[PDB]
């Protein structure tokens, strides 16, 4: 509907801090197979 809109990405704040926990969780799974 809007005339003149442009194409770009939108960075969202929750995704990076939860991605820190996601990397932490992947590391925890990987270390959890070690024993």
């Amino acid at each position: 509907v809007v005339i003149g809109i442009v194409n770009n990405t939108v960075y969202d704040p929750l995704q990076p801090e939860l991605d820190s926990f996601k990397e932490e969780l992947d590391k925890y799974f990987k270390n959890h197979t070690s024993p």
Binding site: V1, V2, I3, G4
Partner: protein
């Protein structure tokens, strides 16, 4: 061409379709109403003139 900036200082150009969104924000209406009803609003203004 410049909204209200020319009366306060250096003239700063601004698109009219954004100046009207600023006016709507001034009267307490969110700006997306203009971007969704621009054609109808323009027709209203022309008919009023």
């Amino acid at each position: 061409t410049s909204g209200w900036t020319f009366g306060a200082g250096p003239a700063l150009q601004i698109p009219f379709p954004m100046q009207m969104a600023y006016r709507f924000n001034g009267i307490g209406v969110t700006q997306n109403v203009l971007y969704e009803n621009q054609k109808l609003i323009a027709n209203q203004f022309n008919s009023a003139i």
